[PDB]
Design a protein around this ligand. Structure first.
Ligand SMILES: [Cl-]
Ligand SMILES: [Cl-]
Ligand SMILES: [Cl-]
Length: 163
């Protein structure tokens, strides 16, 4: 584990991360997709071999020795708020199991279901709080990746508030 397990936020492309493994905001089919998924596909295309997995699950595939954890959050266009909330919490619980199993000391993670799977709603707080619920019991350094300047500030405020 990390000597003093921490949360940090970075506003940059998760394909450029400085961590021991990455979480992909994957689709269920293991397709190249859009947004974070497409960036992940460009950087680590070998990790898409048999990466298809259901909503609410995570499946790790190695790119060389570098683990890509494909985490499938729900598309809120299709799920009810209630069922989508359940599957989004479940996806993050499966990420925490994989990060523990891998024995990594750090992980790069995006906010699942916040972009094209958001169903047009701001889900920063919902998705970040499910991330915390799952990752708080892990000892990996967690680095959250985002692109929006206002989101970076809000994620940073949420991390510091708990410390
Ligand atoms: Cl960048
Ligand atoms: Cl998304
Ligand atoms: Cl963002």
């Amino acid at each position: 584990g990390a000597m003093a397990p921490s949360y940090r936020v970075k506003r940059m492309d998760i394909a450029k991360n400085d961590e021991e493994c990455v979480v992909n905001a994957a689709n269920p089919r293991g397709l190249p997709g859009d947004g974070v998924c497409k960036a992940v596909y460009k950087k680590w295309p070998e990790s898409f071999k048999n990466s298809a997995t259901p909503v609410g699950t995570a499946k790790t595939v190695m790119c060389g020795t570098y683990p890509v954890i494909h985490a499938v959050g729900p598309n809120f266009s299709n799920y009810t708020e209630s069922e989508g909330d359940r599957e989004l919490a479940a996806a993050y619980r499966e990420v925490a199991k994989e990060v523990t199993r891998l024995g990594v000391n750090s992980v790069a993670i995006p906010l699942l279901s916040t972009g094209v799977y958001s169903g047009g709603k701001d889900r920063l707080t919902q998705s970040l709080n499910h991330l915390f619920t799952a990752m708080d019991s892990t000892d990996a350094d967690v680095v959250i990746y985002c692109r929006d300047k206002e989101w970076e500030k809000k994620i940073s405020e949420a991390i510091q508030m708990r410390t």
